[PDB]
Each structure stands twice: as C-alpha cells, then as structure tokens.
Amino acid sequence: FVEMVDNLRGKSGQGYYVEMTVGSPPQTLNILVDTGSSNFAVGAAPHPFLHRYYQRQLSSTYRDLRKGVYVPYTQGKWEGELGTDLVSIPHGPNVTVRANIAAITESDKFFINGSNWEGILGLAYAEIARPDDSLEPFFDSLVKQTHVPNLFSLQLCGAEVLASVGGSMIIGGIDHSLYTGSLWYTPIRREWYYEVIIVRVEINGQDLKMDCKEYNYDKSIVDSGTTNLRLPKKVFEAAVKSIKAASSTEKFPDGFWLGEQLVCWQAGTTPWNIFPVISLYLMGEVTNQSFRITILPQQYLRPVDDCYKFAISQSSTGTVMGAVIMEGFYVVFDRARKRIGFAVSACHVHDEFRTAAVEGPFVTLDMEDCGYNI
Ligand SMILES: N#Cc1cccnc1N1CC[C@]2(c3ccc(F)cc3F)N=C(N)O[C@@H]2C1
C-alpha cells in the first residue's frame, strides 16, 4: 500500500482528486474522488476552467456506446456521451480496467475555477448512476475485471491561493499505518449512496435530545465530494444555537453562521477553546450499540490574519458527512461486508487540550427506528 499513500491532492473546499490515465496511449487527468455519486465522468471538450480534457479520438481503445446522458444537479448540470475505455490509477493498484466513461461535452456551473481536476470518479453504487442502474460504475468494473478486493479506504488530511490539502485513497485494502486505536464499523443501510444511521448528536457533551429519526431525515450519507457537514434544518438550527452559546464570549455576524462570511483572528491567535466539540454517534453493527466520532473546531472551521469559514450548513436532503467530517478520520468503505469503518487518522487535527476521537460502544434503545423506510 506504500505506493498509494499520499496519492490525493486538492484545494480547500474544492475536493480531493486522484491522478488517473484514460485511453491508449494514456491521457493524464486529475479526477475528483466522490463517494456521493456513481458516474465516472470527464471533461471531453474545451471549457474556460479546464486546462486539459479527454480526447476520445486520440485513444485507440475507445469504444462508443452510442448513448447520450444528461445530468442535472440542483445548482449545475452536465451532458455527455457514453463510451468505454481503458483506465488506470498510476498511484493505485497495478491494474487496468475497461470502464464506462461519460465524456462531458457541455456543462453549466459544474467545473470549478482553479480546482485542478478535470473529471469525477463516482464511487457509490449503480442504483444512483445515470442514465440508470445498468451503467456499471467504475469500482464495480474494477472488482469484476481484476482480483482487487471489494473495498477502499480514504484518509483525507485537509489543512494568496486556497490552501493545498492531501490524503490517501487505498484501493483493495486497509493500511494500518494510516490510523491509530480501534476501527469501529457502522452498517451500510442501503447500497445506493453510502447510507448510514446517526442515533445521537452532542455539542460539547450536551445531547441535542431529538428523536433520532430527525438526524436521518430523509437520509444520512458519507460523501467525500461535499465539503461541509450538512444537517437537516431542525438539527442545524439546534446545532448552531448550541455552538453560538459555547462561543458567546465572542460575537460573529449572521453571515458567518450562514457559512457565507469569513472570520479572522491575528495569526496564531485563533481561540479554538471557545468552540465546542461535536459528537456524532453512528449505529453499531450490534443492534442497540453505537460509537461516536468527535470532531474539533479545527475541522468545522475551514481556513480560507487566519481566516475561517463555518463549514456546517443546512440541508433539505438529509445529513451529509462531508470532507470536513472525514478529515478527522481514516474511513473504510468495506463494500464486501456492507459496512463503513472509522478510526482516528494519523493526520487528525489536535491541539494540546483536545483531539478527534472514535469511541465505543455506547448503548441506546431502538435505533432501527432511527431510519427512513424507503
Ligand atoms: N449523486 C448525486 C447527486 C444527486 C442530487 C444532487 N446532487 C448530487 N451530487 C452529485 C455531484 C456532486 C458534485 C461534485 C462536484 C462538483 F463540482 C459538482 C457536484 F454537483 N458530488 C457530490 N458528492 O455532491 C454533488 C451533487
């Protein structure tokens, strides 16, 4: 796994990408690692924010599928042409896969200015692929065509220009040098998104005391392709109220709490201690058990004087455990056993007083009733 360590790079708030090659001879592209989607899709035509793109005509191994695809998001969109080609990950497993590729020919508000990536690697399941679930996602193809074990793990490390970030994507195994302490597993509730169940939330040790259904309304997912911790309205409001109280020693504009305005202190004078830790308790493999991941202000205040943006925001599509949550931790996407594991990362954030943590078990009653019945 030594060759896969530190194979991720990115800019703060713009996602983590891995280097891939597509076609014969290999075309080098940087590809966003995205556990929140299921299409392998790459820019395939000129764009203002693209410094390179996939040129199908230069590839001897490209095969046209004679099928179009249109993919709208809430904020942006892209359309493209479906095909197959040979794909490799230079700092990944020593294998080559014939994968589905959506060649993006037109897009609106999709590509990010300065992000340094040219495509997206959807690592989630076929159920949410476009145009439909018959378009085998990349990881499925990799596992079927090669001997690579059905799992991958992500260590995202995070912290003029936006700060550069790094991490590792370990494909086909778990690298023990990348974490400390125990690995705790939460079940994948359904193979579509990487859906999980949160049973309890605490802010500075204080229970938010909501019906746990609220935490997973209408779902909760683990998503490397989203920056923030996104929370359902009711939970978000209770969360900020508590965070505001803990830090009321100082006062910030509404725009900060809205995740819009930045907030700065003199360099090195960031008062971390006035901000509370946040504990998310995830359902255990055992029915009435859970374990908690505890995250520090260092994670949910994202650097952009030292200037920070509040990286927790309101959602209407359920909880999203985005990059800022994942950054504390080594995260194992154990598809083979339908579970996601968390452990304290070798690159976790910590000051002399507090530290990110993964701790269990804690015993709770009725947590199957915490979900959303499809
Ligand atoms: N599936 C789905 C899905 C379903 C409904 C709404 N959104 C989805 N997401 C998939 C694309 C996405 C993304 C990534 C990068 C980027 F520049 C833009 C971008 F929209 N990736 C994630 N993880 O969330 C984003 C929206």
Tab-separated table of C-alpha atoms and ligand atoms in Angstrom:
chain	number	residue	atom	x	y	z
A	1	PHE	CA	0.000	0.000	0.000
A	2	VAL	CA	3.118	2.161	0.253
A	3	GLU	CA	2.703	3.293	-3.367
A	4	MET	CA	-0.842	4.527	-2.683
A	5	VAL	CA	-0.015	6.738	0.332
A	6	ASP	CA	-0.426	10.459	-0.404
A	7	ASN	CA	-1.970	9.822	-3.818
A	8	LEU	CA	-4.602	12.541	-3.215
A	9	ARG	CA	-4.350	16.325	-3.599
A	10	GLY	CA	-6.799	19.228	-3.723
A	11	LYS	CA	-7.582	22.809	-2.746
A	12	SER	CA	-9.523	23.625	0.445
A	13	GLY	CA	-13.228	23.460	-0.328
A	14	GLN	CA	-12.764	22.195	-3.879
A	15	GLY	CA	-12.458	18.444	-3.264
A	16	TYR	CA	-9.724	15.800	-3.286
A	17	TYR	CA	-8.545	14.411	-6.612
A	18	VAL	CA	-6.505	11.380	-7.672
A	19	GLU	CA	-4.422	11.125	-10.878
A	20	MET	CA	-5.776	8.695	-13.496
A	21	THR	CA	-4.987	7.815	-17.090
A	22	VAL	CA	-7.623	7.207	-19.709
A	23	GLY	CA	-7.165	5.645	-23.141
A	24	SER	CA	-4.245	4.333	-25.212
A	25	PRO	CA	-1.797	5.970	-25.174
A	26	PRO	CA	-2.657	7.076	-21.615
A	27	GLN	CA	-4.135	10.568	-21.204
A	28	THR	CA	-3.357	12.028	-17.774
A	29	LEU	CA	-6.234	13.650	-15.883
A	30	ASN	CA	-6.952	14.635	-12.274
A	31	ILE	CA	-10.191	13.129	-11.066
A	32	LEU	CA	-12.325	14.085	-8.069
A	33	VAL	CA	-12.814	11.245	-5.585
A	34	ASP	CA	-16.555	11.288	-4.898
A	35	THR	CA	-18.354	8.826	-2.613
A	36	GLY	CA	-21.573	10.781	-3.178
A	37	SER	CA	-22.149	9.791	-6.820
A	38	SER	CA	-21.764	6.858	-9.173
A	39	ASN	CA	-20.672	8.071	-12.628
A	40	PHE	CA	-17.136	8.219	-13.998
A	41	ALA	CA	-17.431	11.457	-15.990
A	42	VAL	CA	-14.681	13.555	-17.534
A	43	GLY	CA	-14.480	16.841	-19.423
A	44	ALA	CA	-14.207	15.917	-23.104
A	45	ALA	CA	-14.332	19.333	-24.744
A	46	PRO	CA	-12.806	22.784	-24.146
A	47	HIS	CA	-14.002	24.758	-21.112
A	48	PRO	CA	-12.780	28.026	-19.505
A	49	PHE	CA	-11.919	26.232	-16.243
A	50	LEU	CA	-10.317	23.184	-17.875
A	51	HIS	CA	-6.641	23.142	-18.737
A	52	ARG	CA	-6.932	19.700	-20.308
A	53	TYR	CA	-9.639	17.222	-21.283
A	54	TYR	CA	-10.237	13.677	-22.535
A	55	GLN	CA	-9.816	13.440	-26.301
A	56	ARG	CA	-11.596	10.291	-27.422
A	57	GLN	CA	-10.203	10.491	-30.952
A	58	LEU	CA	-6.647	10.161	-29.630
A	59	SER	CA	-7.461	6.828	-27.976
A	60	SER	CA	-7.034	3.566	-29.891
A	61	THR	CA	-9.060	1.710	-27.272
A	62	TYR	CA	-12.111	3.994	-27.049
A	63	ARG	CA	-15.455	2.371	-27.843
A	64	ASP	CA	-18.564	4.462	-28.475
A	65	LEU	CA	-21.743	3.299	-26.718
A	66	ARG	CA	-23.919	5.454	-28.988
A	67	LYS	CA	-25.866	6.686	-25.973
A	68	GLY	CA	-26.268	10.186	-24.546
A	69	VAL	CA	-26.701	11.208	-20.910
A	70	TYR	CA	-27.931	14.384	-19.201
A	71	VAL	CA	-27.165	15.042	-15.540
A	72	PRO	CA	-28.814	17.973	-13.708
A	73	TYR	CA	-27.874	18.970	-10.178
A	74	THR	CA	-29.696	21.492	-8.007
A	75	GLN	CA	-27.115	24.168	-8.805
A	76	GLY	CA	-25.424	22.950	-12.003
A	77	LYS	CA	-25.595	20.439	-14.860
A	78	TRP	CA	-23.669	18.486	-17.481
A	79	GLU	CA	-24.406	16.452	-20.593
A	80	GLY	CA	-22.220	13.961	-22.372
A	81	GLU	CA	-21.667	10.907	-24.488
A	82	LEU	CA	-21.286	7.408	-23.088
A	83	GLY	CA	-18.428	5.112	-24.064
A	84	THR	CA	-15.830	2.709	-22.699
A	85	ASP	CA	-12.046	2.931	-22.475
A	86	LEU	CA	-9.013	1.576	-20.618
A	87	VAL	CA	-8.463	3.252	-17.273
A	88	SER	CA	-5.618	3.117	-14.762
A	89	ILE	CA	-4.596	4.768	-11.495
A	90	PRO	CA	-0.814	5.266	-11.581
A	91	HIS	CA	-0.547	5.528	-7.785
A	92	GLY	CA	-3.218	2.879	-7.277
A	93	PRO	CA	-3.429	-0.852	-7.897
A	94	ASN	CA	-1.233	-2.226	-10.663
A	95	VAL	CA	-4.192	-2.998	-12.941
A	96	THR	CA	-6.090	-1.625	-15.918
A	97	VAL	CA	-9.865	-1.651	-16.295
A	98	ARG	CA	-12.298	-1.189	-19.158
A	99	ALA	CA	-14.635	1.317	-17.572
A	100	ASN	CA	-17.714	3.239	-18.565
A	101	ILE	CA	-16.879	6.869	-19.199
A	102	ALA	CA	-19.256	9.795	-19.641
A	103	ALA	CA	-17.465	12.177	-21.987
A	104	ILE	CA	-18.698	15.612	-20.875
A	105	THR	CA	-19.329	17.778	-23.944
A	106	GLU	CA	-21.335	20.622	-22.352
A	107	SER	CA	-21.766	21.825	-18.761
A	108	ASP	CA	-23.111	24.656	-16.614
A	109	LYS	CA	-21.626	25.606	-13.223
A	110	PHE	CA	-20.002	22.186	-12.849
A	111	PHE	CA	-16.255	22.606	-13.228
A	112	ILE	CA	-14.561	24.759	-10.591
A	113	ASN	CA	-12.185	27.619	-11.414
A	114	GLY	CA	-8.733	26.647	-10.133
A	115	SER	CA	-9.746	23.308	-8.604
A	116	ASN	CA	-7.152	21.434	-10.693
A	117	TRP	CA	-9.455	18.481	-11.517
A	118	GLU	CA	-10.969	17.567	-14.870
A	119	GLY	CA	-13.442	14.809	-14.046
A	120	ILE	CA	-15.275	12.997	-11.265
A	121	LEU	CA	-14.980	9.403	-10.059
A	122	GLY	CA	-18.297	8.359	-8.595
A	123	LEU	CA	-17.514	5.628	-6.058
A	124	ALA	CA	-21.066	4.895	-4.943
A	125	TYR	CA	-23.473	2.263	-6.188
A	126	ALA	CA	-25.215	1.568	-9.518
A	127	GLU	CA	-28.610	2.402	-8.022
A	128	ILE	CA	-27.920	6.138	-8.388
A	129	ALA	CA	-25.953	6.075	-11.657
A	130	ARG	CA	-27.168	7.954	-14.737
A	131	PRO	CA	-28.910	7.316	-17.083
A	132	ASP	CA	-29.924	4.322	-14.941
A	133	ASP	CA	-28.595	1.463	-12.834
A	134	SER	CA	-27.495	-0.596	-15.845
A	135	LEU	CA	-24.418	1.625	-16.282
A	136	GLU	CA	-21.825	-0.224	-14.217
A	137	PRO	CA	-19.874	2.232	-12.009
A	138	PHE	CA	-16.070	2.259	-12.042
A	139	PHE	CA	-15.437	0.353	-8.821
A	140	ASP	CA	-17.809	-2.448	-9.848
A	141	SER	CA	-15.869	-2.815	-13.119
A	142	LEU	CA	-12.555	-2.812	-11.242
A	143	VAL	CA	-13.640	-5.580	-8.883
A	144	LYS	CA	-15.241	-7.711	-11.604
A	145	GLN	CA	-12.351	-7.467	-14.055
A	146	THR	CA	-9.432	-7.709	-11.622
A	147	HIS	CA	-8.620	-9.547	-8.404
A	148	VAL	CA	-8.805	-6.335	-6.321
A	149	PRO	CA	-10.708	-6.938	-3.015
A	150	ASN	CA	-14.081	-5.181	-2.842
A	151	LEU	CA	-13.218	-2.277	-0.527
A	152	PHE	CA	-11.360	1.026	-0.428
A	153	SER	CA	-10.364	3.458	2.257
A	154	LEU	CA	-9.940	7.218	2.407
A	155	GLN	CA	-7.613	9.250	4.562
A	156	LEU	CA	-8.364	12.926	3.876
A	157	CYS	CA	-5.951	15.261	5.607
A	158	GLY	CA	-7.032	18.792	4.785
A	159	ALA	CA	-5.096	21.678	6.348
A	160	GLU	CA	-2.985	34.353	-1.998
A	161	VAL	CA	-4.400	30.978	-3.016
A	162	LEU	CA	-6.603	28.374	-1.347
A	163	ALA	CA	-4.651	26.031	0.928
A	164	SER	CA	-3.431	22.781	-0.620
A	165	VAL	CA	-4.628	19.595	1.006
A	166	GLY	CA	-3.525	15.970	0.715
A	167	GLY	CA	-4.702	12.456	1.573
A	168	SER	CA	-4.616	8.799	0.528
A	169	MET	CA	-7.064	6.535	-1.271
A	170	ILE	CA	-6.151	2.936	-0.536
A	171	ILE	CA	-7.788	0.577	-3.005
A	172	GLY	CA	-8.299	-3.054	-2.124
A	173	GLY	CA	-7.267	-2.889	1.489
A	174	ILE	CA	-6.739	-1.220	4.837
A	175	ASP	CA	-3.383	0.412	5.607
A	176	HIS	CA	-2.782	0.093	9.338
A	177	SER	CA	-0.058	2.752	9.391
A	178	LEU	CA	-2.698	5.338	8.485
A	179	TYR	CA	-4.646	5.099	11.718
A	180	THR	CA	-4.391	4.620	15.488
A	181	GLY	CA	-6.651	2.901	18.014
A	182	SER	CA	-9.686	0.824	17.098
A	183	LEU	CA	-11.688	0.735	13.847
A	184	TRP	CA	-15.431	0.980	14.511
A	185	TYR	CA	-17.973	-0.085	11.870
A	186	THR	CA	-21.430	1.259	11.062
A	187	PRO	CA	-23.663	-0.729	8.661
A	188	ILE	CA	-24.366	0.486	5.149
A	189	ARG	CA	-28.142	0.741	5.434
A	190	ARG	CA	-28.738	0.557	1.688
A	191	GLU	CA	-26.383	0.254	-1.260
A	192	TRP	CA	-27.141	3.425	-3.195
A	193	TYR	CA	-25.390	6.334	-1.569
A	194	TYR	CA	-23.161	5.205	1.270
A	195	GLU	CA	-26.130	5.490	3.632
A	196	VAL	CA	-25.617	5.234	7.383
A	197	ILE	CA	-27.576	5.865	10.598
A	198	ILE	CA	-26.862	8.534	13.231
A	199	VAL	CA	-28.510	7.769	16.580
A	200	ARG	CA	-27.298	10.659	18.774
A	201	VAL	CA	-25.687	14.093	18.456
A	202	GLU	CA	-23.899	16.010	21.231
A	203	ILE	CA	-22.407	19.500	21.262
A	204	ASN	CA	-19.805	19.935	23.999
A	205	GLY	CA	-21.084	16.795	25.729
A	206	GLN	CA	-24.666	18.068	25.699
A	207	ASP	CA	-27.233	15.847	23.996
A	208	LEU	CA	-29.307	17.643	21.336
A	209	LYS	CA	-32.087	15.358	22.658
A	210	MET	CA	-34.006	14.980	19.400
A	211	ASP	CA	-35.856	11.923	18.098
A	212	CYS	CA	-33.078	10.141	16.193
A	213	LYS	CA	-35.282	9.985	13.095
A	214	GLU	CA	-34.557	13.747	12.834
A	215	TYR	CA	-30.825	13.083	12.355
A	216	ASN	CA	-31.525	10.877	9.319
A	217	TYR	CA	-34.352	12.774	7.627
A	218	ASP	CA	-34.570	11.810	4.900
A	219	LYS	CA	-31.198	10.022	4.890
A	220	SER	CA	-27.616	10.322	6.120
A	221	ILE	CA	-24.665	9.683	3.824
A	222	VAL	CA	-20.875	9.730	3.847
A	223	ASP	CA	-19.764	11.949	0.945
A	224	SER	CA	-16.168	12.861	0.072
A	225	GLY	CA	-17.493	15.077	-2.723
A	226	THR	CA	-19.230	17.514	-0.365
A	227	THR	CA	-17.149	19.947	1.690
A	228	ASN	CA	-19.449	20.701	4.641
A	229	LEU	CA	-21.239	18.824	7.361
A	230	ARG	CA	-24.781	19.384	6.136
A	231	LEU	CA	-27.619	18.917	8.617
A	232	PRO	CA	-31.408	18.817	8.260
A	233	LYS	CA	-32.998	22.188	9.155
A	234	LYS	CA	-34.265	21.253	12.633
A	235	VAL	CA	-30.931	19.709	13.573
A	236	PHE	CA	-28.918	22.531	12.024
A	237	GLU	CA	-30.823	25.167	13.996
A	238	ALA	CA	-30.361	23.313	17.286
A	239	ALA	CA	-26.686	22.834	16.464
A	240	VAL	CA	-25.844	26.494	15.779
A	241	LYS	CA	-27.774	27.625	18.846
A	242	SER	CA	-25.555	25.381	20.951
A	243	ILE	CA	-22.358	26.386	19.146
A	244	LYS	CA	-23.291	30.083	19.455
A	245	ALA	CA	-23.801	29.639	23.197
A	246	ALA	CA	-20.490	27.866	23.784
A	247	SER	CA	-18.632	30.636	21.952
A	248	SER	CA	-20.826	33.557	23.024
A	249	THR	CA	-17.672	35.007	24.630
A	250	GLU	CA	-17.197	36.493	21.168
A	251	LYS	CA	-19.764	37.628	18.624
A	252	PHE	CA	-19.829	36.993	14.886
A	253	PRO	CA	-22.041	38.285	12.066
A	254	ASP	CA	-25.006	36.215	10.909
A	255	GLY	CA	-23.197	35.680	7.606
A	256	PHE	CA	-20.556	33.612	9.386
A	257	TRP	CA	-23.114	31.267	10.906
A	258	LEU	CA	-24.706	31.155	7.471
A	259	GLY	CA	-21.356	29.887	6.208
A	260	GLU	CA	-21.040	32.892	3.923
A	261	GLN	CA	-18.771	35.388	5.668
A	262	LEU	CA	-15.291	34.546	6.862
A	263	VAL	CA	-13.950	35.331	10.317
A	264	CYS	CA	-10.361	36.249	11.136
A	265	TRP	CA	-8.049	36.493	14.121
A	266	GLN	CA	-4.473	37.741	14.309
A	267	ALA	CA	-2.156	34.994	13.050
A	268	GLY	CA	-1.849	32.252	15.670
A	269	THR	CA	-4.421	33.801	17.987
A	270	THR	CA	-7.329	31.625	16.861
A	271	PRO	CA	-9.314	30.927	20.077
A	272	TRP	CA	-10.170	27.267	19.360
A	273	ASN	CA	-11.111	26.738	23.016
A	274	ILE	CA	-14.303	28.812	22.846
A	275	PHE	CA	-15.707	26.460	20.210
A	276	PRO	CA	-17.267	23.156	21.343
A	277	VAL	CA	-16.539	19.653	20.040
A	278	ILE	CA	-19.305	17.844	18.133
A	279	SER	CA	-20.002	14.159	18.667
A	280	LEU	CA	-21.945	12.118	16.104
A	281	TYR	CA	-22.974	8.679	17.315
A	282	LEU	CA	-23.276	6.151	14.468
A	283	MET	CA	-25.291	2.930	14.665
A	284	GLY	CA	-23.113	-0.060	15.528
A	285	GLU	CA	-23.020	-3.469	13.897
A	286	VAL	CA	-24.847	-4.637	17.052
A	287	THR	CA	-28.500	-3.520	17.061
A	288	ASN	CA	-28.576	-1.401	20.223
A	289	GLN	CA	-24.943	-0.218	20.130
A	290	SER	CA	-23.364	2.910	18.704
A	291	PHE	CA	-19.946	4.555	18.657
A	292	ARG	CA	-19.084	8.231	18.469
A	293	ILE	CA	-16.821	10.246	16.232
A	294	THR	CA	-15.854	13.502	17.888
A	295	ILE	CA	-14.747	16.379	15.708
A	296	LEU	CA	-12.915	19.571	16.650
A	297	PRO	CA	-13.379	23.230	15.597
A	298	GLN	CA	-10.202	22.680	13.574
A	299	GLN	CA	-12.361	20.569	11.275
A	300	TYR	CA	-15.612	22.523	11.120
A	301	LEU	CA	-13.944	25.904	10.807
A	302	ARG	CA	-12.404	25.767	7.297
A	303	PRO	CA	-9.408	28.035	6.561
A	304	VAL	CA	-9.736	30.444	3.627
A	305	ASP	CA	-4.677	37.008	9.784
A	306	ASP	CA	-6.134	33.475	9.961
A	307	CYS	CA	-9.476	33.468	8.159
A	308	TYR	CA	-12.096	30.736	8.596
A	309	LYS	CA	-15.445	29.781	7.133
A	310	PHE	CA	-18.045	27.965	9.226
A	311	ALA	CA	-18.263	24.604	7.472
A	312	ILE	CA	-21.631	23.382	8.806
A	313	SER	CA	-24.696	24.141	6.720
A	314	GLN	CA	-28.406	23.488	6.354
A	315	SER	CA	-29.704	20.651	4.225
A	316	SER	CA	-33.101	19.654	2.846
A	317	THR	CA	-31.888	16.295	1.576
A	318	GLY	CA	-30.713	14.749	4.851
A	319	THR	CA	-27.418	14.662	6.742
A	320	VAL	CA	-24.217	14.778	4.696
A	321	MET	CA	-20.977	13.781	6.422
A	322	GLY	CA	-18.686	15.664	4.048
A	323	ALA	CA	-14.943	16.126	3.771
A	324	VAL	CA	-14.644	18.236	6.944
A	325	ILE	CA	-16.072	15.349	8.995
A	326	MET	CA	-13.962	12.771	7.133
A	327	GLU	CA	-10.759	14.766	7.725
A	328	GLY	CA	-10.523	13.708	11.369
A	329	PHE	CA	-10.518	10.072	10.369
A	330	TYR	CA	-9.449	7.019	8.418
A	331	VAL	CA	-12.605	5.885	6.663
A	332	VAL	CA	-13.045	2.337	5.366
A	333	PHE	CA	-15.612	1.716	2.641
A	334	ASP	CA	-15.974	-2.022	3.237
A	335	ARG	CA	-18.390	-2.833	0.393
A	336	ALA	CA	-17.718	-6.561	0.730
A	337	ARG	CA	-19.193	-6.589	4.269
A	338	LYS	CA	-21.708	-3.760	3.735
A	339	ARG	CA	-20.131	-1.520	6.384
A	340	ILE	CA	-18.142	1.690	6.876
A	341	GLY	CA	-15.341	1.843	9.417
A	342	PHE	CA	-13.932	4.872	11.244
A	343	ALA	CA	-10.682	5.251	13.138
A	344	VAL	CA	-8.556	8.162	14.314
A	345	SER	CA	-6.310	9.186	11.434
A	346	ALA	CA	-2.540	9.596	11.622
A	347	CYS	CA	-3.187	13.082	10.226
A	348	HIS	CA	-6.021	14.065	12.577
A	349	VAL	CA	-6.296	17.604	13.918
A	350	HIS	CA	-5.420	18.181	17.565
A	351	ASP	CA	-4.354	20.905	19.949
A	352	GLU	CA	-2.661	20.340	23.304
A	353	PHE	CA	-6.052	20.042	25.008
A	354	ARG	CA	-8.395	18.164	22.676
A	355	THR	CA	-8.326	15.568	19.943
A	356	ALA	CA	-10.597	13.934	17.380
A	357	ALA	CA	-11.731	10.565	18.696
A	358	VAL	CA	-13.590	7.393	17.774
A	359	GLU	CA	-15.046	5.745	20.858
A	360	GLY	CA	-17.476	2.900	21.659
A	361	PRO	CA	-19.626	1.136	22.449
A	362	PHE	CA	-22.446	3.263	23.809
A	363	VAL	CA	-25.797	1.581	24.356
A	364	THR	CA	-29.012	3.070	23.003
A	365	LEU	CA	-32.565	1.732	22.633
A	366	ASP	CA	-34.351	1.267	19.289
A	367	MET	CA	-32.046	2.546	16.571
A	368	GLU	CA	-33.570	0.646	13.679
A	369	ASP	CA	-36.399	3.096	14.260
A	370	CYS	CA	-33.893	5.883	13.548
A	371	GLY	CA	-34.071	5.390	9.781
A	372	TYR	CA	-36.368	6.346	6.892
A	373	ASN	CA	-38.422	3.451	5.453
A	374	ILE	CA	-37.625	3.886	1.727
B	1	LIG	N1	-25.235	11.612	-6.865
B	1	LIG	C1	-25.757	12.615	-6.733
B	1	LIG	C2	-26.431	13.876	-6.575
B	1	LIG	C3	-27.833	13.859	-6.593
B	1	LIG	C4	-28.535	15.041	-6.445
B	1	LIG	C5	-27.836	16.219	-6.279
B	1	LIG	N2	-26.519	16.228	-6.268
B	1	LIG	C6	-25.783	15.132	-6.414
B	1	LIG	N3	-24.402	15.318	-6.357
B	1	LIG	C7	-23.600	14.702	-7.413
B	1	LIG	C8	-22.483	15.641	-7.923
B	1	LIG	C9	-21.694	16.209	-6.750
B	1	LIG	C10	-20.757	17.263	-7.317
B	1	LIG	C11	-19.391	17.093	-7.179
B	1	LIG	C12	-18.510	18.029	-7.696
B	1	LIG	C13	-18.987	19.145	-8.365
B	1	LIG	F1	-18.129	20.064	-8.869
B	1	LIG	C14	-20.349	19.322	-8.512
B	1	LIG	C15	-21.232	18.387	-7.994
B	1	LIG	F2	-22.554	18.609	-8.164
B	1	LIG	N4	-20.925	15.240	-5.989
B	1	LIG	C16	-21.366	15.198	-4.754
B	1	LIG	N5	-20.843	14.359	-3.799
B	1	LIG	O1	-22.391	16.061	-4.492
B	1	LIG	C17	-22.668	16.814	-5.666
B	1	LIG	C18	-24.088	16.756	-6.183
